[PDB]
Design a binder for these strands. Structure first.
Ligand SMILES: [Cl-]
Ligand SMILES: [Cl-]
Ligand SMILES: [K+]
Ligand SMILES: [Mg+2]
Ligand SMILES: [Mg+2]
Ligand SMILES: [Mg+2]
Ligand SMILES: [Mg+2]
Ligand SMILES: [Mg+2]
Ligand SMILES: [Mg+2]
Ligand SMILES: [Mg+2]
Ligand SMILES: [Mg+2]
Ligand SMILES: [Mg+2]
Ligand SMILES: [Mg+2]
Ligand code: NA
Ligand code: NA
Ligand code: NA
Ligand code: NA
Ligand code: NA
Ligand code: NA
Ligand code: NA
Ligand code: NA
Ligand code: NA
Ligand code: NA
Ligand code: NA
Ligand code: NA
Ligand SMILES: [Sr+2]
Ligand SMILES: [Sr+2]
Ligand SMILES: [Sr+2]
Ligand SMILES: [Sr+2]
Ligand SMILES: [Sr+2]
Ligand SMILES: [Sr+2]
Ligand SMILES: [Sr+2]
Ligand SMILES: [Sr+2]
Ligand SMILES: [Sr+2]
Ligand SMILES: [Sr+2]
Lengths: 46, 194, 56, 65, 81
RNA sequence: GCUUUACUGCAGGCUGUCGCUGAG
RNA sequence: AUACAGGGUGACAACCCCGUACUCGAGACCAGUACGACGUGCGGUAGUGCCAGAGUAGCGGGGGUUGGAUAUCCCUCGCGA
RNA sequence: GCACGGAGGCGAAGAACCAUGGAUUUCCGAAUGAGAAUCUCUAACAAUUGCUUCGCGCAAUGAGGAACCCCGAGAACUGAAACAUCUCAGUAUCGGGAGGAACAGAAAACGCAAUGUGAUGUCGUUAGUAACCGCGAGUGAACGCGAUACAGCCCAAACC
């Protein structure tokens, strides 16, 4: 496909969000990203 | 003594006789070539307009509107209906043509508010009414002792809520006693049975 | 050719996309109309009383 | 912190703008050192610079420049 | 008001461009044009920009590869930040 | 769902009449 | 104790803490209302057919609607003081 | 900040925090210079109106809001132990529109008929009464009265 600049920004955001919950948050909250996505198993919007 | 106005009034009691008859025969030829809503600088029936609140002042507008004659332009049922709800031809709308005229006029002038309207005749396929509209934002009107009332917020889009003289008549609000049990204070509060 | 699985492989057309006005993936890029908020169809926001139980 | 509201209001329009460019540069260099993963940082200032710039901008608006 | 230059893009590939092609790399505002990037750079480090190549990245930012004139030395320019 | 000289109605077509509509 | 409502505090707390009664303060609404004041000027007699809202009031054809039945309200076509 | 980490910082130049007021407030969005799946292209009240210095100069409209409210459009399942009038119901749903509430409202009223009442909502009652109806199933007021709250005015014309 051909992605517009805006589509690109959105894909970029989705990529960023798709990360682990920082280790330090674990400690601070004394004990998981529910929005973790996989390119294959999942399907983004658009 | 008789006012000059009384003469315009008396002429319009029989628009089919005398000079008026000849005028209408002439005028209508032009109206038929005009649009749906034509603003006009002067009311065709001065006496009537002044009587309904018209004034020769800034913020006061008059427009003639034509509407197709006849009953409801309804589409036949495309699903199951008991005989009672299959009618199409003899069914008529609940709003009279003068009301439809006032609404089209008011849509044309979104910033103005309907004051009143009156009939100016018809031919075999349409009817014409002139509608008096007021500019609630013009200072000449905001300062008018006889019209400033129409500047209040609750008067916005008054015609669309039936607050017009023609609106109130069509809603069965004329009578204050017998026969208005289901019209006053509103058709809706009375379950829509009026 | 079955209407099922074999016919599913021919589907690679993009229709519904992220809507500029509401943000839902409902802007039909062919019709240029959002099936969710009405963008492209009406200035007013798409809404219906059947979207909830009658007395609620 | 280091920069207070008084000091800012006591500056002339030209001084605020000069102070502005100066602050922006320190920030830019901070973000640069941060981009290089540099460690000789002081997390507080990078945060202070932002507020300082907001203060000067707020004052410039209040005074009319 | 948004600024043009956001920050230096420092990575192995960037270092090479700097050591072998006298090029500097920056993360810039995605609304900045090649020309606006050229100016900003000349006005921030006082050098002569010869060419600018841009790329809208999958990180949501715009990356600029700015080549300096032979009269300037990227290695040294970058070494003062 | 379908049919027809089932019951009852509804569009639609034809036709008269009234309005549009005037002069000798 | 005019305070024995409720909560908190390492277990059943009026007296450990927040509060609670009493008293007090501010905002909002009531309301640009009530009162008050400015200006205006109420009313009555005799005479005068000078004025007082038309497709209206009313009637008929066709519909809808209503508890509205001969006696509901409305639309439509025609007629019409 | 949620959030009980590490590092670092701020606070007696009185921070945090709270109240009131102000500043900043990207892009799309009624979305309004043109176009576009939130971006792009070359000065903008687009469009419809009022006024008009007839120039977008001054203004209005647009869209939103839980329901409530006003004006229009308007079913069927269902009940009648079938079913067509009737019923479900002017309900569901649809179109348009206003406000903080709407709508109504100072009698061409009522008609306990009177030597009587006196704008209008609403509440209680009048009453499942009068009235309607394959006179079947079912539908169903009003005047009055007791209350709540109370408020009465402005034009057209005559004459100028
Ligand atoms: Cl209006
Ligand atoms: Cl009485
Ligand atoms: K039925
Ligand atoms: Mg990665
Ligand atoms: Mg007067
Ligand atoms: Mg009501
Ligand atoms: Mg490129
Ligand atoms: Mg735009
Ligand atoms: Mg049955
Ligand atoms: Mg019925
Ligand atoms: Mg039976
Ligand atoms: Mg009923
Ligand atoms: Mg009665
Ligand atoms: Na996928
Ligand atoms: Na209007
Ligand atoms: Na960056
Ligand atoms: Na079947
Ligand atoms: Na009725
Ligand atoms: Na009739
Ligand atoms: Na804000
Ligand atoms: Na405007
Ligand atoms: Na203009
Ligand atoms: Na049955
Ligand atoms: Na049956
Ligand atoms: Na019946
Ligand atoms: Sr798959
Ligand atoms: Sr409006
Ligand atoms: Sr085949
Ligand atoms: Sr196959
Ligand atoms: Sr395909
Ligand atoms: Sr469209
Ligand atoms: Sr809707
Ligand atoms: Sr990356
Ligand atoms: Sr009169
Ligand atoms: Sr009273």
């Amino acid at each position: 496909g051909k992605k517009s600049k805006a589509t690109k920004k959105r894909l970029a955001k989705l990529d960023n969000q798709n990360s682990r919950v920082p280790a330090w948050v674990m400690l601070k909250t004394d004990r998981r990203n529910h929005k973790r996505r996989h390119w294959r198993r999942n399907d983004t919007d658009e | 003594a008789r006012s000059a106005y009384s003469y315009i009034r008396d002429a319009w009691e029989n628009p089919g006789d005398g000079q008026l008859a000849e005028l209408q025969w002439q005028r209508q030829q032009e109206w038929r070539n005009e649009g749906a809503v034509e603003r006009i600088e002067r009311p065709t029936r001065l006496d009537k307009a002044r009587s309904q609140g018209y004034k020769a002042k800034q913020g006061v507008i008059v427009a003639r509107v034509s509407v197709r004659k006849g009953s409801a332009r309804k589409r036949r049922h495309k699903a199951g209906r008991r005989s009672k709800r299959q009618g199409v031809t003899r069914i008529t709308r609940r709003k009279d043509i003068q009301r439809v005229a006032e609404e089209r006029a008011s849509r044309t002038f979104p910033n103005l508010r309907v004051l009143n309207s009156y009939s100016v005749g018809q031919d075999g396929r349409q009817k014409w009414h002139e509608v008096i509209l007021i500019d609630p934002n013009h200072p000449a009107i905001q300062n008018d002792d006889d019209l400033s009332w129409i500047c209040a917020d609750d008067q916005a889009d008054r015609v669309f809520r039936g607050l017009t003289g023609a609106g109130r008549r069509n809603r069965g609000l004329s009578g204050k006693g017998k026969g208005s049990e289901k019209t006053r204070p509103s058709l809706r509060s009375n379950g829509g049975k009026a | 050719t079955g209407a099922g699985t074999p016919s599913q492989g021919k589907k690679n057309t993009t229709t519904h996309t992220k809507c500029r006005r509401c943000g839902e993936k409902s802007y039909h890029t062919k019709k240029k109309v959002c099936s969710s908020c009405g963008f492209g169809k009406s200035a007013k926001r798409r809404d219906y009383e059947w979207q909830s139980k009658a007395g609620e | 912190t280091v920069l207070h509201v008084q000091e800012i209001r006591d500056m002339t329009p030209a001084e605020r703008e000069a102070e502005l460019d100066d602050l922006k540069t320190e920030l830019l260099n901070a973000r640069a050192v941060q981009a290089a993963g540099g460690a000789p940082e002081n997390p507080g200032r990078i945060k202070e610079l932002r507020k300082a710039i907001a203060r000067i901008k707020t004052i410039q608006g209040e005074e009319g420049d | 008001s948004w600024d043009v230059i956001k920050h230096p893009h420092v990575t192995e590939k960037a270092m090479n461009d700097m050591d072998f092609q006298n090029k500097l790399q920056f993360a810039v505002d995605d609304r900045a044009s090649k020309g606006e990037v050229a100016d900003a750079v000349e006005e921030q480090y006082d050098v002569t920009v010869e060419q600018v190549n841009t790329q809208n990245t999958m990180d949501g930012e715009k990356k600029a590869v700015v080549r300096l004139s032979e009269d300037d030395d990227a290695q040294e320019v970058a070494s003062r930040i």
